[PDB]
Design a protein around this nucleic acid. Structure first.
Ligand SMILES: [Zn+2]
Lengths: 124, 101, 49, 92, 68, 181, 74, 75, 119, 49, 184
RNA sequence: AUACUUACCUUAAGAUAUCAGAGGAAAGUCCUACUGAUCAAACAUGCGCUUCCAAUAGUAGAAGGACGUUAAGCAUUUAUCAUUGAACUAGUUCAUUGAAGUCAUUGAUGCAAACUCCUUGGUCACACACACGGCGCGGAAGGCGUG
RNA sequence: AAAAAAAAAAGGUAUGUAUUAA
């Protein structure tokens, strides 16, 4: 499927589509953007998947097909208290090289902003 | 006296006192004297073990752990025992810890 | 406290022109005014007699 | 942290809530603090068992909040800029 | 006008029962020492829920109330 | 309290007795109602239930005398919605739509507008619009109705099939504003 | 405005008896005379009785932890 | 650290849900940083409005930990 | 003293992280945060079977286990195998570390000595 | 003046705010009268010379 | 700490709920931020998808079947032309954004409950909110009580007849040339 | 952008890899673009390292979706409580009074299929080549190693 | 034999008023 870097922390992984497990047995799958000290994180396009009480008997030990009722909720902010564990689903729309490119161009543009602001403030 | 007034070393002397003289001195005297301790968790089963280390939060490192857990369904009971060589225990689960004679 | 009155059912001579409980078409009026209310319609009845 | 700052950026916009009790409060966000406890205006409430009601004003404790749904257009909001250039802070 | 901390300082090395919040279990024993979080140490304790227990350490979160 | 202070007032006795003397005027009904509302003005859940029972029975007894009033079914629905029970709002929308034999443009538009907020389960929500369509859909001014319905597809639906499906039907209807679509 | 712990201090000095509800799991409610309190809202109750939820047994002078406190009611 | 902002709520009759099941209604008096809320003329709401409802006391204080949602029924 | 600083020297070891759910995770261990957030690499995480003539297992842990996406359809018992699970710290109950490593070398904290050597 | 300042300001401080506003307006009128008197005195001084 | 407001790019020192609340509500910060999301929102419509092309080797069959089909002519406007037509199309989209046909409100203007519903300030659901939505109005009506007793006869030289239905500017030559009857 | 008026407010602390040895200002501290070991980051760079990267010699197929249709699909189970009066067996029906009452019953639960539509990929080069299981150019994602 | 004084505003955000062109 997908191989995550053998040493990769929550800061190394951004924009990866994640799979988030809460205490209540439901899952939030989507792109991570930010997170925090106490690990409450922000997902971009996320869908909460749930195993109904009626399908649950199908998971108890004996090819299984579970009907997982899920609903779509975009740009949420989770709470660190509820989060249990996190897994990686996919890798970002952009490669590593391309993200280096956009990072460098973004930084250069950011410096250009500071110069254009400084010299717009100084003379007038 | 509140803790935010004290300096960096006064907290170290405070923790040294609390470990040496205080409730957790029951565990400390148990670590030095090689006396096995009984620990009840909130998960409702009990480990008979020997404490190699402990800490402020009560989380502690153990050696020769023996876990004892029973379960019942409709008043049908079974006792299960699980042996472990070395273990690390997070301190929030524990409730009572006694020092065996 | 309040009585519920149906001037249609009253002028039509039917029985149930008033009730304590709220029913679909009745108008709430003050109980003490109920007697007064009857006065206001009597001439209409007097025209039919 | 950024997650709370995004909640402060969502003031005056329709948001959704999930309390850990199971209910759902969807409505317009008036106030929010750094303790994540928010107060909402003209909100529709869904009880854990589905019964839906309506209340004009509500205040919820942040510890009981589970997830908050925020208008999608805040995704590209400047909080998420990785490389950003700030000026020098004023001297006081 | 006694407050909790001087109340524990006055209950040292006296016989005190402590009710935990779970099974309505109370440990009856001579208090030894307390922490700033009101961790408890006990000698010659007995568990009531019938047994006899030599020495006890009780963590602060699980106790319901402390009585003499 | 406020209730008893409203009863002992002379204006309630006079306005009321006028209504009960002259039922079909609708001028005395609307004064009796506008007055008993304004007495209650903090109409939120705090106000005592006797007064809410009176004002509610006043609406429901007025709408029976005049089965066609659209803005009053709407207004009484909104009173029930601000008061915190949406089930009574639904029911009395159903009542107004039933008084018109399910065809009135304002009660369907102002109804579904209410229905967008208080009803999840996208399927049922759209069944409301399909029920409204086979009734009031061909109304000459119904375009703004469709503007709601198209607005609800593009927000709900990821496929975009249904938007072409519906907008293709709107093309063939001689509405007042066809050109917008 | 009347801060809540100020109100509790008005329960200490006014010597009014109080009923206090615990968490919904335990199933008992305590009542007695609140004597003094700490910053953590853990209170000492003199002449306290535990009522299951009126045959409850009398407790004593008892320190009750603030973690289990739900209501303090006169 | 920061005091919760109830400032518009105080003196207004307010309903708030204690834990999962319970719902208490009373006139808010004061509050603190833990959202401990003291109110007067408390009443415990139940299924039957006049019947199962029973008043608590002249002054009641609530631990902020058991507070879930707080709605004011008032202006 | 913070005993979590011990776990940070256990890096690159086979370990079981036994959580509050009863869920057990066997895996190779990577950097442990100061809050005891434990990040693993190649993990097989499962639930034990209480036998007791069919005692229903944790209902939340089965759902949380199927929802990792790592449970394969043809597994007869209840397990899942996946790469890179990151575990919040407060979820951990017990940690069973291997028998081979010696504690006397790892249980020495450099800050504890540093405080005594300096005084 | 009440409807304009009533929206943003709390209702409990609306009364004292209103009284302070009326007092300020009165003080403004007084200052205007004093300026008028000074103007009259200046006119008289210009007429005497 | 210090609160950096990245919309305005201006720092504010020692963040406090009062000063931060005042800045966020501030008029300048308001204009700056609103314009910011106006740009960030116009971009997603402005940005071209530019999806990647995958070209496969055309088979011998469809090259022969497509060779007999004649080549179609393509039209390409001049730069000066396409700039103007893009301007026009964009300004037409902006027009279709703001249309929102209200004619129902124009129909019921004289209804007995018109003041309780369509005025939207005096309503129940939305009524109380509009008051708090009123701006601070720093410096420098249609009441609900109306009855049917006003305007008893809706027509006494009062009303304007209903506005004619609109028409597309492009196809405006499609209209039937002459009316069926003689209007004044 | 400048000037004036009014309002709201002001500094948690400390630190920037560790260990050991030699030197400078018996104990400790500080320091040495000093010496070794270990660790970490960035940058390069390699491995017959591992996995993956779609038909045109054809009208296809792989991954993932539909908050899509068939579809009132098929098979199941559900639609408030209290008080009074009448009849009634020894619980049932009707009428009245009060309380709350998410919508749905074309619903909800389970079961399965068919169809249709969306997003994505090197739709690369050489080759149509009787083998015992390689050593074409790149891209993506990793593991390991040296500098 | 002994002796005598001190050096200072800071600067952020918001609101209202005036100025910066045929
Ligand atoms: Zn700003």
């Amino acid at each position: 499927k997908i191989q995550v870097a053998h040493s990769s922390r929550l800061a190394n992984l951004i924009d990866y589509k994640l799979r988030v497990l809460t205490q209540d047995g439901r899952v939030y799958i989507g792109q991570l953007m930010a997170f925090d000290k106490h690990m409450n994180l922000v997902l971009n396009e996320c869908i909460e998947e749930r195993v109904p009480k009626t399908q649950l008997d199908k998971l108890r030990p004996r090819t299984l097909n579970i009907k997982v009722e899920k609903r779509v909720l975009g740009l949420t902010i989770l709470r660190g208290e509820q989060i249990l564990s996190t897994v990686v689903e996919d890798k970002p729309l952009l490669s590593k090289k391309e993200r280096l490119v956009r990072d460098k161009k973004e930084k250069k543009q950011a410096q250009k902003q500071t110069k254009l602001r400084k010299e717009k403030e100084k003379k007038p | 006296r509140p803790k935010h007034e004290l300096s960096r070393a006064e907290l170290e002397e405070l923790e040294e006192f609390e470990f040496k003289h205080g409730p957790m001195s029951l565990i400390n005297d148990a670590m030095v004297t090689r006396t096995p301790v009984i620990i009840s968790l909130r998960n409702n089963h009990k480990i008979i073990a020997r404490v190699k280390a402990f800490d402020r939060h009560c989380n502690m490192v153990l050696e020769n752990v023996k876990e004892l857990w029973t379960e019942k369904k409709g008043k049908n009971v079974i006792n299960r025992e699980r042996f472990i060589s070395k273990l690390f225990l997070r301190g929030d689960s524990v409730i009572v810890v006694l020092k065996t004679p | 406290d309040i009585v519920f009155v149906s001037p249609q059912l009253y002028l039509s001579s039917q029985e149930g022109w008033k009730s304590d409980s709220a029913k679909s078409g009745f108008i709430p009026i003050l109980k003490n005014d109920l007697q007064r209310f009857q006065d206001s319609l009597k001439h209409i009845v007097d025209a039919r007699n | 942290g950024i997650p709370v700052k995004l909640l402060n950026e969502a003031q005056g916009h329709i948001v959704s809530l999930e309390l850990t009790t199971g209910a759902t409060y969807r409505g317009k966000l008036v106030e929010s603090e750094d303790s994540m406890n928010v107060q909402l205006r003209d909100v529709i409430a869904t009880e854990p068992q589905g019964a839906v009601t309506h209340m004009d004003q509500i205040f919820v404790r942040g510890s009981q909040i589970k997830f908050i749904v925020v208008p999608d257009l805040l995704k590209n909001a400047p909080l998420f800029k990785k490389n950003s250039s700030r000026p020098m802070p004023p001297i006081r | 006008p006694v407050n909790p901390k001087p109340f524990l300082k006055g209950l040292v090395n006296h016989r005190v029962g402590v009710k935990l919040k779970f099974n309505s279990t109370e440990y009856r024993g001579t208090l030894v020492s307390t922490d700033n979080y009101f961790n408890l140490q006990l000698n010659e304790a007995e568990e009531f829920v019938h047994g006899t227990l030599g020495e006890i350490f009780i963590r602060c979160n699980n106790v319901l109330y402390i009585r003499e | 309290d406020k209730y008893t202070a409203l009863i002992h007032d002379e204006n309630f006795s006079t306005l009321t007795l006028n209504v009960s003397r002259y039922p079909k005027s609708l001028a005395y009904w609307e004064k009796l109602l506008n007055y008993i509302v304004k007495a209650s003005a903090p109409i939120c859940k705090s106000t005592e239930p006797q007064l809410l029972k009176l004002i509610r029975c006043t609406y429901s007894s007025m709408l029976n005398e005049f089965p066609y009033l659209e803005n009053y079914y709407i207004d009484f629905a909104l009173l029930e919605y601000k008061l915190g029970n949406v089930s009574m709002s639904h029911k009395i929308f159903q009542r107004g739509l039933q008084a018109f034999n399910q065809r009135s443009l304002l009660l369907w538009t102002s109804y579904l507008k209410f229905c967008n907020n208080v009803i999840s389960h996208q399927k049922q929500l759209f069944k409301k619009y399909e029920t409204a369509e086979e009734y009031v859909g061909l109304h000459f001014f119904s375009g703004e109705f469709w503007d709601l319905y198209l607005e609800q597809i593009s927000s709900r639906c990821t496929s975009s099939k249904k938007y072409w499906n519906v907008l293709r039907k709107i093309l063939e209807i001689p509405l007042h504003s066809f050109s917008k679509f | 405005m009347v801060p809540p712990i100020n109100c509790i201090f008005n329960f200490l000095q006014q010597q009014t008896p109080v009923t206090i509800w615990l968490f919904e799991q335990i199933g008992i409610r305590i009542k007695g005379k609140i004597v003094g309190f700490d910053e953590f809202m853990n209170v000492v109750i003199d002449e306290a009785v535990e009522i299951p939820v009126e045959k409850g047994t009398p407790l004593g002078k008892i320190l009750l932890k603030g973690d289990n406190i739900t209501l303090i009611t006169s | 650290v920061s005091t919760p902002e109830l400032k518009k709520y105080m003196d207004k009759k307010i309903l708030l849900n204690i834990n999962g099941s319970r719902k208490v209604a009373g006139i808010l008096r004061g509050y603190d940083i833990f959202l401990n809320v003291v109110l007067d003329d408390a009443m415990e709401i139940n299924g039957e409005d006049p019947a199962n409802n029973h008043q608590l006391g002249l002054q009641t204080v609530i631990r902020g930990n058991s507070i879930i949602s707080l709605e004011a029924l008032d202006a | 003293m913070k005993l979590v600083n011990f776990l940070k020297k256990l890096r690159n070891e086979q370990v079981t992280i036994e959580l509050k759910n009863g869920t057990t995770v066997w895996g190779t261990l990577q950097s442990v945060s100061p809050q005891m957030n434990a990040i693993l690499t190649d993990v097989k995480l499962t639930l034990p079977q209480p036998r007791l003539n069919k005692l229903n297992s944790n209902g939340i842990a089965m759902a949380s286990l199927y929802l990792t996406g790592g449970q394969q359809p043809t597994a007869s018992d209840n397990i899942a195998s996946l790469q890179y699970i990151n575990i919040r710290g407060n979820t951990i109950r017990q940690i069973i570390l291997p028998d081979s490593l010696n504690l006397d070398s790892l249980l020495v904290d450099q800050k504890q000595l540093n405080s005594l050597r300096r005084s | 003046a009440a409807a304009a300042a009533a929206a943003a300001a709390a209702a409990a401080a609306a009364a004292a705010a209103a009284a302070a506003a009326a007092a300020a307006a009165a003080a403004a009128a007084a200052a205007a009268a004093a300026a008028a008197a000074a103007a009259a005195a200046a006119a008289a001084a210009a007429a005497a010379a | 700490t210090r609160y950096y407001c990245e919309y305005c790019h201006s720092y504010l020192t020692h963040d406090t709920l009062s000063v931060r609340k005042s800045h966020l509500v501030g008029k300048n910060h308001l204009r700056i931020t609103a314009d910011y999301y106006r740009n960030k929102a116009r971009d997603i419509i402005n940005k071209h998808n530019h999806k990647r092309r995958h070209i496969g080797k055309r088979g011998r069959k469809e090259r022969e079947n497509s060779s007999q089909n004649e080549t179609l002519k393509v039209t390409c406007l001049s730069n000066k032309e396409k700039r103007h037509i893009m301007h026009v199309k964009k300004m037409n989209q902006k027009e279709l954004a703001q249309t929102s046909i209200d004619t129902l409100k124009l129909l019921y203007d004289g209804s007995p409950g018109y003041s309780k519903v369509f005025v939207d300030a005096n309503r129940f659901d939305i009524g109380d909110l509009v008051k708090a939505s009123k701006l601070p109005q720093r410096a420098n009506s249609r009441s609900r009580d109306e009855t049917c007793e006003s305007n008893p006869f809706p027509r006494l030289n009062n009303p304007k007849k209903l506005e004619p239905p609109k028409i597309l500017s492009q196809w405006s030559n499609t209209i039937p040339k002459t009316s069926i009857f003689y209007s004044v």
